[PDB]
Scaffold this motif. Structure first.
Motif, PDB file in Angstrom:
ATOM      1  N   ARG A   1      99.419  28.940  17.377  1.00 38.38           N
ATOM      2  CA  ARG A   1      99.063  28.260  18.522  1.00 38.38           C
ATOM      3  C   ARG A   1      98.003  27.232  18.186  1.00 38.38           C
ATOM      4  NH1 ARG A   1      97.075  33.922  21.689  1.00 38.38           N
ATOM      5  NH2 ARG A   1      96.493  34.768  19.868  1.00 38.38           N
ATOM      6  N   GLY A   2      98.432  26.126  17.369  1.00 43.38           N
ATOM      7  CA  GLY A   2      97.423  25.358  16.964  1.00 43.38           C
ATOM      8  C   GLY A   2      96.299  25.833  15.975  1.00 43.38           C
ATOM      9  N   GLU A  12      94.585  28.676  11.043  1.00 45.90           N
ATOM     10  CA  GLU A  12      95.049  27.448  11.281  1.00 45.90           C
ATOM     11  C   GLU A  12      96.852  27.523  11.454  1.00 45.90           C
ATOM     12  OE1 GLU A  12      95.586  23.928  10.186  1.00 45.90           O
ATOM     13  OE2 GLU A  12      93.997  22.762  11.186  1.00 45.90           O
ATOM     14  N   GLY A  13      97.479  28.383  12.170  1.00 48.61           N
ATOM     15  CA  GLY A  13      98.985  28.553  12.066  1.00 48.61           C
ATOM     16  C   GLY A  13      99.496  27.320  12.216  1.00 48.61           C
TER      17      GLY A  13
END
Length: 14
Positions: A1-2, A12-13
């Motif tokens: 999620r962002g 930082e997926g």
């Protein structure tokens, strides 16, 4: 999620 950050560990997926 962002971007996810917690415990000092940044994630930082997408």
């Amino acid at each position: 999620r962002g971007k996810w950050t917690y415990n000092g560990i940044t994630y930082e997926g997408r």
